[PDB]
């Protein structure tokens, strides 16, 4: 691989989570020459090995401030590891639940613009994410949000992606809408109290999630635009970013 790193340059500290393929740790990465940095470390059939590491191969393609950075991989020895830049505030949904009502509308829009820029980048690189959700976005101490996570998540998924089991950047726009709703509701679960079948039923009857408490109308309307049934009518991510940039420069619109 590239970003291949010798395991001797890796200091594992606290276990912080439980992964599909094993433990996730906080630690430090000291490559000689380079400054020591802080990393999250995922540790691991050959099938499962190849799979585990595929996210490093995919993540290795990207460089953008709102896309999680691959700092390194260990594939020459055991355990196999994936090292990413450490994000101190964890997953966006739980971070917002912890801070319910405590960030301004401007701050929240900045988080959403960050995510939309990350997505604009992915779409530009013809990469379709398929599981864009607040739980798959990470947050650092400066509140910078980064897309992560490189069997259908029903409530985040566009109707046509559910119907055809095929995904596009326009289906990612739908998911982005759900993510806006999650942010402005401070990490409430989409369709709070509904089962998956209830949600699909609702969406087919043209039900849409309402404005979250205290949510400016301009933001909720952009959600509804991302949730247009015709996927061609949905804004592309350059347009999502432009629309958020307008609100930011005219922030009486965020009253
Ligand atoms: C499955 O648990 C899991 C998966 C992936 C990560 N990756 C990662 N990469 C960079 N930074 C972080 N920081 C985190 C992530 C957290 O949960 C998602 C988290 O709360 C446990 C946290 O707290 C300090 C930091 N994570 C991490 C994890 Cl746990």
Asked if residue 153 lies in contact with residue 217, where contact means CB atoms within 8 angstroms, the answer is no
Pocket test of ligand 1: the residue of 21, 40, 88 to mutate, having most ligand atoms within 8 Å of its CB, is 40
Asked if residue 209 lies in contact with residue 181, where contact means CB atoms within 8 angstroms, the answer is yes
Two tokens, residue 240: 């999502």
6, 93, 100, 131: which one is catalytic? 131
Q: Is 70 exposed, middle or buried (0-12, 13-18, 19+ CB in 10 A)?
A: buried
- Give the chain's largest Cα–Cα span: 60
Asked if residue 91 lies in contact with residue 138, where contact means CB atoms within 8 angstroms, the answer is yes
**Residue 145: CB within 6 Å of ligand 1?**
no
**Residue 138: CB within 6 Å of ligand 1?**
yes
Nearest CA to ligand 1 atom 1: 19
Q: Which long-range contacts (CB under 8 A, 24 or more apart) does 4-8 make?
A: 4/72, 4/73, 4/74, 4/75, 4/76, 5/29, 5/31, 5/72, 5/73, 5/74, 5/83, 6/74, 6/76, 7/74, 7/76, 7/77, 7/81
| Neighbour order of strands in the sheet with 10-18 | 10-18, 23-29, 37-43, 81-85, 70-74
Nearest CA to ligand 1 atom 7: 40
Please confirm, yes or no, whether 225 is among the known catalytic residues: no
Among residues 178, 157, 164, 190, the alpha carbon closest in space to that of 220 is found at 178
Q: Hey, what domains does the chain have and what are their CATH numbers?
A: 1-86 (3.30.200.20), 87-254 (1.10.510.10)
**Residue 13: CB within 6 Å of ligand 1?**
no
Nearest CA to ligand 1 atom 22: 90
Q: Report CA(208)–ligand 1 centroid distance (Å).
A: 31
Pocket test of ligand 1: the residue of 28, 91, 150 to mutate, having most ligand atoms within 8 Å of its CB, is 91
Q: Annotated binding residues for ATP, as ranges?
A: 16-24, 42
The resolution, in Å, is 1.9
Q: Report CA(181)–ligand 1 centroid distance (Å).
A: 22
Alpha-carbon gap, residue 147 to 138, rounded angstroms: 7
DSSP E strands, the chain? 10-18, 23-29, 37-43, 70-74, 81-85, 137-139, 145-147
Nearest CA to ligand 1 atom 14: 90
- With H, G, I as helix, E, B as strand and everything else as coil, classify residue 140: coil
């Amino acid at each position: 691989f590239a970003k291949e790193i010798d395991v001797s340059y890796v200091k594992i500290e606290e276990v912080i989570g439980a992964g599909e393929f094993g433990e996730v740790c906080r630690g430090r990465l000291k490559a000689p020459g380079k400054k020591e940095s802080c990393v999250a470390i995922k540790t691991l059939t050959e099938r499962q090995r190849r799979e585990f590491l595929s996210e490093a191969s995919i993540m290795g393609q990207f460089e953008h401030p709102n896309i999680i950075r691959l700092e390194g991989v260990v594939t020459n020895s055991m355990p196999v590891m994936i090292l990413t830049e450490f994000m101190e505030n964890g997953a966006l949904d739980s971070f917002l639940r912890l801070n319910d009502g405590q960030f301004t509308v401007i701050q929240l829009v900045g988080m959403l613009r960050g995510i939309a820029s990350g997505m604009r980048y992915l779409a530009e690189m013809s990469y379709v994410h398929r599981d864009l959700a607040a739980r798959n976005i990470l947050v650092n101490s400066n509140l910078v949000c980064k897309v992560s996570d490189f069997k259908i998540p029903i409530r985040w998924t566009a109707p046509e992606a559910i119907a055809f089991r095929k995904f596009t950047s326009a289906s990612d726009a739908w998911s982005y809408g759900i993510v806006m709703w999650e942010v402005m509701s401070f990490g409430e679960r989409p369709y709070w109290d509904m089962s998956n079948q209830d949600v699909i039923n609702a969406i087919e009857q043209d039900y849409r999630l309402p404005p979250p408490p205290d949510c400016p109308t301009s933001l909720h309307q952009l959600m509804l635009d991302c949730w247009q049934k015709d996927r061609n009518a949905r804004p592309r991510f350059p347009q999502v970013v432009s629309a958020l940039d307008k609100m930011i420069r005219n922030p009486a619109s965020l009253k």
